[PDB]
Design a protein around this nucleic acid. Structure first.
Ligand SMILES: Nc1nc2c(ncn2[C@H]2C[C@H](O)[C@@H](COP(=O)(O)OP(=O)(O)OP(=O)(O)O)O2)c(=O)[nH]1
Ligand SMILES: [Ca+2]
Length: 596
RNA sequence: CAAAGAAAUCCAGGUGCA
DNA sequence: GCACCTG
DNA sequence: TTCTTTG
């Protein structure tokens, strides 16, 4: 039933001085060296694997190659993603049992069991504790990526921010007997920070909060102009605009923090009575006026707009922005396009000065985050025709929409994928089931929308490009799962791989084909299932070719068994885009190596 | 002083999947 | 329930 | 880098 070992540090344990009789005495040496290792702690940087080599004697491992099996697991811990696991059997399979000196008295029957127990003891009582002793795992919020930060460096960063917040009077200490609603967490955010409350899990008032949220959204639906969907707005705008489109995307700085609580309170109190009780109005006003958080053994009032991480802040920020929109961003020209997602505005017009006027208007009403502004206005510093907005890239010149992929340089793309689920575990002899979950649709489904696959404003050229890019992601997930099979399942025979990949190619082409038919428009010429299959195969080939030694036989079947010919039925499509990794995808890191 | 342990990743909405 | 996305 | 709780 229990197949997985979690890589996360939370599973660590307090080590004893010695082990009991049924554990072998060899661990006492590592325990002794472990305590001695901490007495030598230096601010100077440390390499964990080097430290373990001073802690765990070679004689524990027997052969130096048996040591490598264990340390490969540690290296995975040092480079883990959120939720990542390994198979427990990795801790005892294929070890050289004849060469482990402290097992030579145990019967051949009982050896693997004992090695699992001692390896687990080392990992849970020495390895993970020594990592946690030196480092703090920071969840970076780019996929499931984790970065390990020296504790001194993390505390120093956190103390800078906390001092700012007190100095600005955003955080004000109250008496320690005031009850807080959660714990303040300062998360690193690309050289900046995100102050959130981690809300205390209170399941008693969750139904009440859902009720209040539903009430606020009914106020919004009933009393405020409901914007068309982003897709409908772009479709109608591109259809009626004949010239060059000009446009701007802007982002509000510190959006929740700059909600003016006195204005929001007045707004809530003016909601009509049939839409919100007097008690519920008073409850919300009291709720957002008295925000109390715990931090480092003290209790603070939060006095900077709405607390990020409180469940009610979401619908209340929307209420505030809808009000701002009614006051300031309504009755705009019929010519123009506008759409707002939370604090992000996308404004376009065929008239450049109207885009300029909108920028001036938005900058008078809000404080803008100027690092996030994107525009093709010629007067601006670095104009560009591709505007990122709501996870898509809108090309103002060609009117084409492409999926936005967030892949910084030297980003390990495996951090995007959740290959292991501790609640739904898969046996080490069921590699097929592991791959089946890895190739399921939902993780990539946001690249399979009407934005990518319509032929209303998108040409076939960009429909095919969107599909190829999505299948590049799928192929990278397949590769990441394959790495997991060989290092954790220890799969020897890979016969079934050809079929899963064939079924996966066909399932994804079939999903794209249906979306293309559903969202067909005037730019549709001819899209064939066969052309989509060929594109999907070429995406896999482009990714598999990054490890041609491992995938040589697989690459060779693809080329000898599958038709890779692409009848685009559109002379504007460029075939060479489908013969190589797109540039955004060409530089992602695919080899994991510990740095700490 | 020594050791041990702790220093808390949350929320709304969306796509959907099956 | 799952696993992605937006802010 | 702090805070408890125990040698
Ligand atoms: N609880 C929570 N709220 C979030 C998260 N991401 C965004 N929000 C909410 C609160 C932010 O104020 C608002 C705008 O999102 P941003 O990502 O633009 O952050 P912010 O505007 O706070 O700061 P900025 O100056 O743009 O870096 O959306 C999140 O991960 N957790
Ligand atoms: Ca913002």
């Amino acid at each position: 039933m229990v197949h997985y070992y979690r890589l996360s540090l939370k599973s660590r344990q307090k080590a004893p001085k010695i082990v009991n009789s049924k554990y072998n005495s060899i661990l006492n040496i590592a325990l002794k060296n472990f305590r001695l290792c901490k007495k030598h702690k230096t601010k100077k940087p440390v390499q964990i694997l080097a430290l373990l080599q001073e802690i765990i004697p070679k004689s524990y491992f027997g052969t130096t190659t048996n040591l490598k099996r264990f340390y490969k697991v540690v290296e995975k811990i040092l480079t883990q993603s959120s939720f990542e696991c390994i198979h427990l059997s990795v801790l005892h399979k294929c070890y050289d049992y004849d060469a482990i000196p402290w097992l030579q008295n145990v019967e051949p029957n009982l050896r693997p069991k004992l090695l699992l127990k001692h390896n687990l003891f080392l990992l849970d009582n020495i390895v993970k504790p020594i990592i946690a002793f030196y480092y703090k795992p920071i969840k970076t919020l780019n996929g499931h990526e984790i970065k390990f930060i020296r504790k001194e460096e993390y505390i120093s960063f956190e103390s800078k921010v906390f001092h700012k917040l007190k100095k600005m009077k955003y955080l004000v200490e109250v008496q320690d007997e005031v009850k807080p609603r959660g714990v303040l967490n300062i998360i690193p955010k690309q050289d900046n920070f995100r102050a959130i409350v981690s809300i205390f899990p209170d399941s008693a008032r969750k139904p009440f909060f859902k009720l209040l949220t539903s009430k606020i959204y009914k106020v919004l639906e009933e009393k405020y102009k409901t914007s068309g969907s982003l897709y409908t707005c772009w479709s109608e705008f591109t259809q009626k605009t004949q010239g060059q489109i000009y446009g701007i995307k802007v982002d509000i700085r510190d959006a929740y923090g700059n909600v003016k609580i006195p204005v929001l309170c007045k707004l809530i109190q003016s909601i009509p009575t049939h839409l919100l009780d007097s008690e519920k109005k008073n409850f919300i006003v009291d709720h957002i006026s008295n925000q109390f958080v715990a931090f480092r053994r003290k209790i603070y009032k939060w006095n900077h707009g709405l607390l990020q991480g409180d469940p009610l802040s979401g619908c209340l920020c929307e209420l505030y922005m809808a009000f701002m929109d009614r006051l300031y961003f309504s009755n705009l020209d019929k010519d123009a396009f506008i759409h707002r997602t939370v604090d992000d505005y996308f404004f376009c017009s065929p008239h450049p000065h109207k885009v300029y006027d909108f920028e001036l208007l938005i900058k008078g009403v809000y404080q803008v985050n100027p690092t996030k502004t994107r525009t093709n206005l010629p007067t601006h510093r670095h104009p560009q025709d591709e505007i990122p907005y709501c996870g898509k890239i809108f090309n103002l010149t060609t009117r084409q929409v492409r999926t936005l992929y967030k892949l910084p340089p030297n980003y390990e793309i495996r951090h995007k994928f959740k290959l292991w689920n501790f609640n739904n575990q898969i046996s080490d002899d069921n590699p097929a089931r592991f791959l089946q979950k890895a190739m399921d649709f939902p993780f990539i489904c946001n690249s399979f929308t009407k934005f990518e696959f319509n032929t209303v404003f998108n040409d076939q050229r960009t429909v095919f490009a969107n599909f190829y890019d999505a299948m590049i992601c799928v192929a990278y997930k397949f590769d990441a799962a394959m790495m997991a099979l060989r290092t954790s399942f220890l799969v020897n025979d890979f016969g079934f791989i050809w079929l899963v990949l064939s079924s996966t190619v066909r399932a994804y082409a079939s999903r794209a084909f249906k979306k293309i038919v559903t969202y067909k428009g005037g730019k549709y010429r001819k899209v064939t299932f066969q052309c989509l299959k060929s594109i999907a195969w070429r995406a896999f080939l482009a990714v598999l070719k990054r490890r041609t030694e491992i995938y040589k036989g697989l690459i060779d079947r693809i080329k000898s068994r599958e038709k890779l010919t692409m009848k685009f039925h559109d002379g504007e499509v460029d075939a060479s885009y489908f013969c190589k990794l797109p540039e955004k995808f060409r530089f992602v890191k695919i080899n994991r190596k510990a740095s700490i």
